[PDB]
């Protein structure tokens, strides 16, 4: 079994298990804004409301789940504040009453002060009926940006794919134990189980089409997920008033921030972070946007011996076939992600009166393809 210091759940993997819905009474003003963002943004009172807030201390957020919920709340409020209605009217300064606690909370949890995958996917969910299981139909997001933004579809299908891949994560100890104990059959069985889980996760990914519209995603939700690293809209970055004097650059939300998105490439010796190129640079940089325990987990995978070298060293077709089943499943996940970017970003952008993500993902897939053994 995996160590508890890495904070990986048996059921939900890297996702935050049963995350908190309500902050303590001290932070009701935060929850008031975050709960009614679709109304407050559209009616144009979001920015005024945030500007009229008091600066609240973070010290009454005691346990982890409360601190994580606050990050989700504050993060969503920040993106709403920065982008507004999402028509290129941009706030270059985040006010100190929201900025100081958000940055202090961000420092405490070891994350950048900006909405990340961990917030808006891994912590942004609840069961409807606790007695019923984890499916889209028994689930809901805590927070959304606008009405008809498809944040439920986008975030929950991402979360279900995250949870699907969790079935493989618990096999990882078996993979490393088998190698040190030279248990070839156990290793073979283990790799096949990883491939089966990654095959299943692709099927779970298909739900994206059922619950997300292309035009809605591109025009509405994409803008709210955008950050301010290399963005012309905030050239110099955002100002966190009363915390840093100069503006600071931080990247927006990305599937690259998912620990699952990276960990299997690490496990299988696919050197995605090698090359010296933009893609490798990106994947490495996004480990800082993961929770500390998860970026430590990716580190300990890298520190363990190579599964690829072990398979190659044995002159074993079955082990190679099983290894390739995992590689093949990842290739299918990259290809499918590419189909999503085409449908949800490229085509809606052409209908406007994209590419860097395609090229990024094509490199990621190409590195995965070239790691096949047969
Ligand atoms: O962009 C996504 N989500 C997202 C992005 C930003 C954000 F702030 C919040 C959510 C989508 C997505 C893309 C790739 C994966 C994925 N999981 C993998 C596991 C293993 C290997 C390859 C994987 N790709 C999962 C979800 C959901 O529509 C595309």
Curated annotation (Swiss-Prot):
Keywords: Cytoplasm, Dioxygenase, Heme, Immunity, Iron, Metal-binding, Oxidoreductase, Tryptophan catabolism
Disulfide bonds: none
Matches recorded under InterPro entries: Indolamine_dOase, Trp/Indoleamine_2_3_dOase-like
Family to which the UniProt record says this protein belongs: Belongs to the indoleamine 2,3-dioxygenase family.
PANTHER family given in the database record: INDOLEAMINE 2,3-DIOXYGENASE, INDOLEAMINE 2,3-DIOXYGENASE 1
Additional record remark: IDO1 is the target for therapy in a range of clinical settings, including cancer, chronic infections, autoimmune and allergic syndromes, and transplantation.
Protein name listed in UniProt: Indoleamine 2,3-dioxygenase 1
Organism in which the protein naturally occurs: Homo sapiens (Human)
């Amino acid at each position: 079994m995996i160590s508890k210091e890495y904070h990986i759940d048996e059921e939900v993997g890297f996702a935050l298990p049963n995350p908190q819905e309500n902050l303590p009474d001290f932070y009701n003003d935060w929850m008031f804004i975050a709960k009614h963002l679709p109304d407050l943004i559209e009616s144009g009172q979001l920015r005024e409301r945030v500007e009229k807030l008091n600066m609240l201390s973070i010290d009454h957020l005691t346990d982890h789940k409360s601190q994580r919920l606050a990050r989700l709340v504050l993060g969503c409020i920040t993106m709403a504040y920065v982008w507004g209605k999402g028509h290129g009217d941009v706030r270059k300064v985040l006010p100190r009453n929201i900025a100081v606690p958000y940055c202090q909370l961000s420092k405490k949890l070891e994350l950048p002060p900006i909405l990340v995958y961990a917030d808006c996917v891994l912590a942004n969910w609840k069961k409807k009926d606790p007695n019923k299981p984890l499916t889209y139909e028994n689930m809901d997001v805590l927070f959304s940006f606008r009405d008809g933004d498809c944040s439920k579809g986008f975030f929950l299908v991402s979360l279900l794919v995250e949870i699907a891949a969790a079935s493989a994560i618990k096999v990882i100890p078996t993979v490393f134990k088998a190698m040190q104990m030279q248990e070839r059959d156990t290793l073979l069985k283990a790799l096949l189980e990883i491939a089966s889980c990654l095959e299943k996760a692709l099927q779970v990914f298909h739900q994206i089409h059922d619950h997300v519209n292309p035009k809605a995603f591109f025009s509405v939700l994409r803008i709210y997920l955008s950050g301010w690293k290399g963005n012309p809209q905030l050239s110099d970055g955002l100002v966190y008033e009363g915390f840093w004097e100069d503006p600071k650059e931080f990247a927006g939300g990305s599937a690259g921030q998912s620990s699952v998105f990276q960990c299997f490439d690490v496990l299988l010796g696919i050197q995605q972070t090698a090359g010296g190129g933009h893609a490798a640079q990106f994947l490495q940089d996004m480990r800082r946007y993961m929770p500390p325990a998860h970026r430590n987990f990716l580190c300990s995978l890298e520190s363990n011996p190579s599964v690829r070298e072990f398979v190659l060293s044995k002159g074993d077709a079955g082990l190679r076939e099983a290894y390739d089943a995992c590689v093949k499943a990842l290739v299918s996940l990259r290809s499918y992600h590419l189909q999503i970017v085409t449908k949800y970003i490229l085509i809606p952008a052409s209908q406007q009166p994209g590419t860097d993500l395609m090229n990024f993902l094509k490199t990621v897939r190409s590195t995965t393809e070239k790691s096949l053994l047969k």
